[PDB]
Design a protein around this ligand. Structure first.
Ligand SMILES: CC(=O)N[C@@H]1[C@@H](O)[C@H](O[C@@H]2O[C@H](CO[C@]3(C(=O)O)C[C@H](O)[C@@H](NC(C)=O)[C@H]([C@H](O)[C@H](O)CO)O3)[C@H](O)[C@H](O)[C@H]2O)[C@@H](CO)O[C@H]1O
Ligand SMILES: CC(=O)N[C@H]1[C@H]([C@H](O)[C@H](O)CO)O[C@@](OC[C@H]2O[C@@H](O)[C@H](O)[C@@H](O)[C@H]2O)(C(=O)O)C[C@@H]1O
Ligand SMILES: CC(=O)N[C@H]1[C@H]([C@H](O)[C@H](O)CO)O[C@@](O)(C(=O)O)C[C@@H]1O
Ligand SMILES: *[C@@H]1O[C@H](CO)[C@@H](O)[C@H](O)[C@H]1NC(C)=O
Ligand SMILES: *[C@@H]1O[C@H](CO)[C@@H](O)[C@H](O)[C@H]1NC(C)=O
Ligand SMILES: *[C@@H]1O[C@H](CO)[C@@H](O)[C@H](O)[C@H]1NC(C)=O
Lengths: 172, 320, 320, 172, 172, 320
């Protein structure tokens, strides 16, 4: 997309991931394991929630009938009304076709961002103790157990605590 | 060889298609409709003090057509006119007809006040017709009197009747002019003399000459009783100058507050609530648009020329 | 010293300026217009069963002015009125004129049905004039008859003519009243006694007193033939009560379906196709806006008060 | 722009580059050479194409004339029409000035993104075997022939295949 | 935000910084010191300035009155006008609620970008001589005086001039 | 341990709340209002050649009511009508009243041309009344003459008066019909003889029969004088046939150019300038919207249903 995260450098999405929108997949010594990131998944929802509230609304404007459904109204005035209406109806057709189209573009790219925003948050945690594989994973250049992994997802992982171990494995 | 942690987004196999500024076929996780395509076949008068008129037409209420007898007075918040609704037992039409209905439909209720008008006994104010039946007998518009001369052929006496608005809000005075089929009929009721009917108020002036000559037959009658109307302002008088052939008010109407007017063919439902109505019934959608009909009334979603506008409620769906 | 790889974007030397939310002078690679400023000098009636009236005015079609002789009936999808178009050979104007034109121009075609009306030979229904010339001889409106008395000065006989709507869709009955220059003219055709013309239907009532007295001269004539009209409902009668001075219909008009009315001064072209028209001709742009005229008809770009709105069709242009 | 790629850290565009929108310029042992990236150049076009499809459109609403160009219409009704129209015409003027202005902003920044999207794609390929010069080039820290270059542009370049050679030249 | 810079990886803003919008805070041997970046601070302003130019505008449409404020107009035509108006008034209410809301979203995120745009510009200057701390600062892995700092803010800082000194302090 | 450089954004303690596509409570550094909620109590006629009418009603200008005496002619760019403005000293009302004022308020000035009309001295054209006081003495509408017979009871002489449009732009001729309270009044001026008033032009025909008989009493006078009007085309005549009871024009009015009509209750200010006005006064805001009133005139911010729309003029505010 705009942010390249979704339908971008991330090959595809995870039909398996039904506990959120944005998440992790570690594979290590102990073995594989999946988990969703709430704080990001929520931010995207909270934003769409907000979109929907504002968009899913009619006015509080009480409209009287200007057209008799049973009687026949004067041809001069009736022709004016038909035009006035058809022109209003043509605007709202447009004002909507555009609103939805634009809000759709923004919704997509907003999600796109909240992904990259995670990747970048994590990249900056892992500092020099990992490398970007280009498909939205970090090859960690140190031993990282289910303790160490949950410390990344929890944004508690400390680079200095593995820094030497990692930097050595990297230069080899 | 090296440990990994991966970043990723959810997905589904059955994802929805929406339109954006760039893509017209963009697939996403979840989406929702913004255009309501479905209607209710019913009018939703829950929490509404409404009045269904049935075959009574709004106009008829002020003049008192047989049908409208149940709807002469009352207070409401919603008026419901119906198709072929009867406003004129005796043939004719109201001058400035549409305007009147719309005024009655936007009204929230009707009071009636008596004119008090009395006439010398050279005049027959009890004048009834076959066209307006009531209890299997000839009758007339309840809120009007048919003024004809007592002795068939005698000239109708010059009379002056004047209504004063005692109330502190404006009243709606309605009256009628009678047009004779032929001069035989004209002279038998009002006499040989040519007739002139002058109505006057502070804000109204108008002269009416009844016209003789045959129309086609309607209910056995080629004669017409057309009606006119005006608002009489508080603490004001309206004066009726007539040589005869004036169908005079026994009652002025007062339109109380305001109310929502629904022209519909659908039945009522008091279980159901709404703020939007059209010919085909109620519209309840929280949605912001609709493609049912550009003729809506009340607080309503805006009519659009789109079947469906799908709004993305989730991210791009990328499948496995 | 070290090998390197560079990434970049293209450009051009002649780049266009567009407007964004922030910048009013933003230069980009390629852009395109959204407001059409150029018109066609012609009307584009390709794939259109159109009727150009020339100097025939739509009203003239229903009464049968000399000009409109070729346009008395027919079916089309596009009606084309012209400037100074002639509707009245004999001086006068139609009461409620504008309404009629608009109804004719909205219509897709015209049927003519015969009234059938016949008159006793005390009446001269062949009454022609110099004002409406046809084959270098005096003539009249093809769809009307001039009713005058046979013997100059003889009083015009009391007649009653009544048209019945045989068809199942409403017909448009047109007629005329004649106003004499002086009472000399009035008495020479209709007599001395005052004349009264009553027209009646289930939905129409009206009395017409012809008025004598000179106006200014128009085509050598200070006398007027004004016309009136009404819709006669299916299975209904319209009755004509007249003492003389009634220009009676030989033909009722029926408006068939609906069609597009173009008021233009531009010539036709059947090579060219369009859905949009104005005074100055056709508008064909796929574009979504136009600044030609706010008076358009058909499926049309929205008139806007902008000379140009340039839409970026490319990236920011940066030269070296 | 928003993404800082175009009219940003990239000094300027390439009048020379007439085979696309987004491209590469390598200089190595062999010497200089230019080539455009179709997959990105296309994505930006395809998106503007789609904009034009949406935007270059009038309604299919047939409007009958309510103003006679030859006849004179009643002053009360005509005054209403003039107002009704001028108010419509005022909206459409605005609704359009906004459509174009917004789509222009998005078009620009969308391009801006499809550039950064490339830079980031490539950076992640070159992994630890190159460094960002800050003007949108990667100084490659190893010998890279027209074979090796075309392997970057083709998104086939493998970091591990040059990794040691590069890492040593880097630390020096 | 979209760019994650503002109210994102940057914990918060600087009430102290009254000479601009976007700026720097170095601490070194000499000690602390603050200074704003004009070129970026201006770009964001210049963009909002332009928004205000577009938005703070009424039409040049002369409207004659179609409603008498003293006289009473015909009820049929008056009811039409009330509807025609209320429909127009309903559009402009909406057309505006959208203009502001959208331009607000873009204003915010545009600022958000012009921050990240700075961070990235600077990161690319500091090359391998510094590291991202994840809170929008660079730990510089060499001695950097008020001369060296002002050389970063001025976009004159040369990595090669400290490169060895830095790379050594980093690997330790 | 290692030297560090930080990037960051500004902020404040008192930041404003705005609405975005996502957030309805988003706090930002600086913002601004787009809806003007404050009005001026005054009309702003700086750089405007305006005419305030005060208690003169526009119609009164063409007939010359006492109040309008200062406003019989002039040229302007802005007309300012007021509440309860007086158009008729002598009781009565103008036929097609509203249409006239709208035409006057659309106009940017008034010329007066003299009819030239003279009458034989069997007629008294100096006819005055108490209803239209001037210099503490009985007077009449300045632009009209009251035509009564010289000898009390004598039958009013048959007269013909005809105005010709000398100018090359259309003029607006106004006149009045007087109805006597009772036949005592009728006979004292014109006698028992029935009166008939015929007016004629190339485009106008109309007959007016005065009606006798008492109405509601207004200012001690039960008789009412009504006015009618028409446009007389350049190089054209309008002819007045009358038996008496015709209030004849001494002056035709001509509307000069076009000008802005403000219906207001607010006082003037020539220090103050504006392009927008409503009942409650002027609106000057650079702002693009306003919630004061949907009845505005001139170049105006669009009326909206929002108290406030706050537009962000700065970034997200995040405090310490
Ligand atoms: C005046 C009267 O009594 N006429 C007798 C007729 O009723 C009748 O012939 C039939 O008359 C019908 C019209 O009769 C009414 C009506 O509309 O019902 C009778 C009404 O009571 C009468 N008005 C009053 C005030 O009482 C009413 C009215 O005066 C109108 O002019 C009618 O237009 O007329 C109808 O025309 C039938 O088609 C007609 O044959 C006969 C009884 O055999 O005698 C009439 O003298
Ligand atoms: C032009 C003219 O005739 N002016 C008369 C005027 C009118 O004739 C009258 O108002 C009808 O339109 O009548 C005037 O006197 C009316 C006056 O007569 C008194 O005797 C009586 O006491 C009063 O109530 C009132 O009716 C008038 O001033 O109106 C005289 C004027 O010359
Ligand atoms: C039927 C009839 O009367 N026809 C005659 C008319 C009318 O009398 C006047 O036009 C009155 O309007 O006048 C003519 O001299 C004319 O116009 O050629 C002869 C014409 O045959
Ligand atoms: C620019 O774009 C237009 C419209 O999209 C296209 O038709 C045209 O070929 C291009 N022209 C030039 C000169 O770039
Ligand atoms: C509407 O605008 C046109 C422009 O010429 C003008 O001629 C017309 O009279 C206007 N109508 C009114 C009633 O203001
Ligand atoms: C339009 O709104 C006002 C509110 O006072 C109302 O009084 C007016 O009559 C309305 N028009 C009609 C015809 O209802």
């Amino acid at each position: 997309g705009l942010f390249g995260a979704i339908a971008g450098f991330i090959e595809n999405g995870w039909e398996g991931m039904v506990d959120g929108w944005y998440g992790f997949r570690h594979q290590n010594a102990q073995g594989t394991g999946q988990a969703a990131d709430y704080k990001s998944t929520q931010a995207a929802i909270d934003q769409i929630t907000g979109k929907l509230n504002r968009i899913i609304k009619k006015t509080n404007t009480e409209f009287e009938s200007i057209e008799s459904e049973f009687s026949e109204i004067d041809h001069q005035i009736g022709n004016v009304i038909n035009w006035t209406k058809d022109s209003i109806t043509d605007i709202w057709t447009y004002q909507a076709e555009l609103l939805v189209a634009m809000e759709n573009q923004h919704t997509i790219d907003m999600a796109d961002s909240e992904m990259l925003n995670l990747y970048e948050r994590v990249r900056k945690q892992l500092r020099q103790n990992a490398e970007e594989d280009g498909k939205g994973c970090f090859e960690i250049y140190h031993a990282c157990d289910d303790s160490c992994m949950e410390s990344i997802r929890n944004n508690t992982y400390d680079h200095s605590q593995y820094r030497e171990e990692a930097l050595l494995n990297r230069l080899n | 060889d090296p440990d990994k942690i991966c970043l990723g987004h959810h997905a589904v196999a059955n994802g929805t298609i929406v339109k954006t500024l760039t893509n017209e076929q963009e697939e996403v996780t979840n989406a929702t409709e913004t255009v309501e395509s479905t209607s209710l076949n019913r009018l939703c008068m829950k929490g509404r003090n409404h009045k269904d008129l049935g075959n009574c037409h709004p106009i008829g209420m002020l003049i008192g057509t047989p049908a409208c007898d149940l709807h002469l007075t009352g207070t409401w918040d919603t008026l419901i006119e119906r198709k072929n609704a009867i406003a004129y037992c005796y043939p004719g039409a109201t001058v400035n007809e549409e305007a009147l209905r719309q005024k009655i439909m936007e009204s929230g209720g009707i009071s009636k006040i008596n004119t008090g008008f009395t006439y010398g006994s050279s005049i027959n104010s009890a004048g009834t017709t076959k066209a307006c039946m009531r209890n299997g007998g000839n009758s007339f518009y309840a809120e009007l009197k048919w003024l004809v001369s007592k002795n068939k052929g005698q000239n109708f006496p010059q009379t002056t009747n004047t209504y004063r608005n005692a109330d502190t809000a404006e009243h709606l005075i309605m009256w009628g002019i009678h047009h004779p089929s032929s001069t035989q009929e004209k002279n038998d009721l009002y006499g040989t003399q040519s007739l002139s009917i002058s109505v006057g108020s502070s804000t109204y002036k108008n002269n009416f000459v009844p016209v003789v000559g045959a129309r086609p037959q309607v209910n056995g009658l080629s004669s017409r009783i057309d009606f006119h109307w005006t608002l009489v302002q508080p603490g004001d008088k309206i004066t009726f100058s007539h040589n005869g052939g004036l169908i005079a008010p026994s009652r002025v109407s007062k339109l109380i507050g305001r109310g929502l007017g629904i022209q519909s063919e659908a039945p009522i439902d008091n279980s159901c609530e709404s703020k939007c109505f059209w010919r085909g019934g109620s519209i309840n959608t929280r949605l912001p648009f609709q493609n049912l009909s550009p003729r809506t009334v009340g607080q309503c979603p805006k009519y659009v020329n789109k079947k469906s506008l799908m709004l993305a409620t989730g991210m791009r769906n990328v499948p496995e």
